[PDB]
Symmetry: C3
């Protein structure tokens, strides 16, 4: 059984450093919020990056925390004009029997505005 | 076990309203075609939107029908010149033991041209 | 249980033919490297294409080798300036109990530079 976990975080500036730190923070909190003990529980992780972020290497953030063996993919987030700027989103596919209503989705910084 | 479900639908005009209605129609038919009784069966849902659609909020369509707890992600569809215009595509990851050849994929409106 | 499989391959020229052949080669090797006997084992396959590739139809390559019933999705890879050019990436979601450290990820041609 698989459960997707969503995450989102914003960065104040378009720099690789800011993007790296933000991605790392989000990944760690998504793991913490769901009590995930090992990366072996993750089937894969998909990232989306908004068009206002340039040198975005979210994969390197995952690598720094040891997710070397977790398959990662990064795609351009649909560029809706006027949408929340500078956002890194995550969709982690988690092998778990955790009920859908018990999965914890994480929205940080300005990304909290994304959820009602 | 997980089975992906594909869906595709076109819109006649580039407006949030047209995109919303089309997305909703597609999602409902994909669920209906596969006899899905609860959203809890969905691991996650990924959407792709073509570059000729601007204010596309497919996630709001999913929310309107109650998919609040289903993790969603939306990415830009590879923009191949001359390809079918104004398409909203869906890839639903379904937790099921349904045989691959028994999963029903849904193509609506002009999107029927996508499949041979 | 699901395990993602990553693949990446580069093409020397931006033509549909070059993209088709490369995609096919990558898909076949990813299957071969993991001893996959049937496509029925694949939940879905997601492709990302870099912005320097134009008429990219990776789905047709999958179709040619018989993956008609495997749900496919293709999105634009985040366009980081100066990143490795002309890359077709794959993320295959595999229903298997294979340990995460035993899954074989495939990087071909210039894509070998992507992994340390």
């Amino acid at each position: 059984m698989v459960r997707g976990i969503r995450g989102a975080i914003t960065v104040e500036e378009d720099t690789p450093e800011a993007i790296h730190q933000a991605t790392r923070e989000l990944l760690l909190k998504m793991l913490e919020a769901n009590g995930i003990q090992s990366y072996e529980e993750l089937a894969a992780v998909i990232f989306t990056v908004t068009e206002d972020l340039t040198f975005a290497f979210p994969a390197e953030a995952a690598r720094q925390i040891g997710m070397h063996r977790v398959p990662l993919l990064s795609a351009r987030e649909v560029p809706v004009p006027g949408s929340l700027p500078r956002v890194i989103r995550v969709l982690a596919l988690w092998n778990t029997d955790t009920p859908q209503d018990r999965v914890r989705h994480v929205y940080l910084r300005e990304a909290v505005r994304l959820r009602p």
